[PDB]
Amino acid sequence: HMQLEIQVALNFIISYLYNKLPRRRVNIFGEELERLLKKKYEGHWYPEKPYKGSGFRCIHIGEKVDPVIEQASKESGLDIDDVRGNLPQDLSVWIDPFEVSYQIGEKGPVKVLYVD
């Protein structure tokens, strides 16, 4: 169901980490994140109204990092500063039904990764 959308988002985020941090830890980070996101989104996914719950589901990585990223990062032995450090500054990722998009920077354009 929401599986696809979550992996699109994950593969995007993870693509910045590989070859920059230990391969195994990035893999765990990726797998753990999927688990955390699937848990968090249950009961908050409305394929009928994709905008509904958008903010609740938004994943941000900037000065303040989303707790799920911190949790996945901790559970994979990755220093949060190393994760934020290899990702674009103030990255925002929206994971909605049938649509995954992101925004690099507070003023950056919203780009689409996946849509239906």
Partner: protein, 252 residues
């Protein structure tokens, strides 16, 4: 809906607020000050520290001109009758420091400085009233705001009656004591893909009913409150994650 408050009726209105807040603990707020006039001096530990030092050197030098408070409950309902209070503070264009453009912008918005100078509220007295009325501290209030770093900076300045803490972390420790719960709508907007811009632009995007002088504290607080509740159901699952949003002011 919006009660203009001056010195002559401060006590009368605070007494009502002392009661309204009991059932309407969600209070949206905004302020109006004489712009930004100074530049931080010294070194900075980071970008966050620079922004804070920028705010500090300006908050310490200027006087708040207007405070707007709109009261609501958990379900976004307003108290019967007056829901918003606009406090006008004493300001003197001949004595007080200020930024030219800001004063001109405010003049165009309807601020009557002459009356502020003659009948304006005394922050020292307002501070005491805030404390002795249960609106400001560790009770069970939810503060709603928009791009509020300066707004809370001015309030902290009044409530402590002193220059802001030199260190950024100390300022937030104190901020938490007086306003343990704060939701900055503009900060929340960063998580809403289709929401951007200032208050007026967000009102448009959310199709909110603007009420009053669309450029003053009271009027703005109304929009903030309306924006918060709509956004809280629309984009947030009827519950803002405190770990990620509580106490976080846009910019700082």
């Amino acid at each position: 809906r919006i009660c203009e408050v001056w010195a002559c009726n401060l006590d009368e209105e605070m007494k009502k607020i002392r009661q309204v807040i009991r059932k309407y603990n969600y209070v949206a707020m905004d302020t109006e000050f004489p712009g930004v006039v100074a530049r931080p001096i010294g070194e900075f530990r980071s970008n966050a520290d620079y922004q804070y030092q920028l705010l500090r050197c300006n908050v310490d030098l200027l006087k708040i001109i207007q405070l707007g408070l709109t009261f609501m409950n958990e379900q976004g309902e307003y108290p019967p009758g007056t829901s918003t209070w606009q406090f006008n503070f004493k300001f003197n264009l001949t004595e007080d420091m200020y930024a030219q453009d800001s004063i001109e912008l405010l003049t165009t918005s309807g601020i009557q400085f002459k009356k502020h100078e003659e009948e304006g509220i005394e922050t020292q007295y307002f501070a005491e009233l805030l404390m002795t009325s249960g609106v400001v501290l560790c009770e069970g209030v939810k503060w709603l705001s928009f791009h509020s770093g300066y707004d809370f900076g001015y309030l902290i300045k009044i409530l402590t009656n002193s220059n802001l803490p030199e260190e950024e972390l100390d300022f937030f420790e104190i901020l938490r004591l007086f306003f343990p719960v704060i939701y900055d709508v503009k900060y929340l907007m960063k998580s809403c893909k289709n929401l951007k811009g200032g208050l007026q632009e967000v009102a448009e995007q959310l199709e909110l009913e603007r009420i009053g002088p669309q450029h003053q504290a009271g009027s703005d607080s109304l929009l903030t409150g309306m924006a918060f509740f709509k956004m809280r159901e629309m984009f947030f699952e009827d519950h803002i994650d405190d770990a990620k949003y509580c106490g976080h002011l846009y910019g700082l």
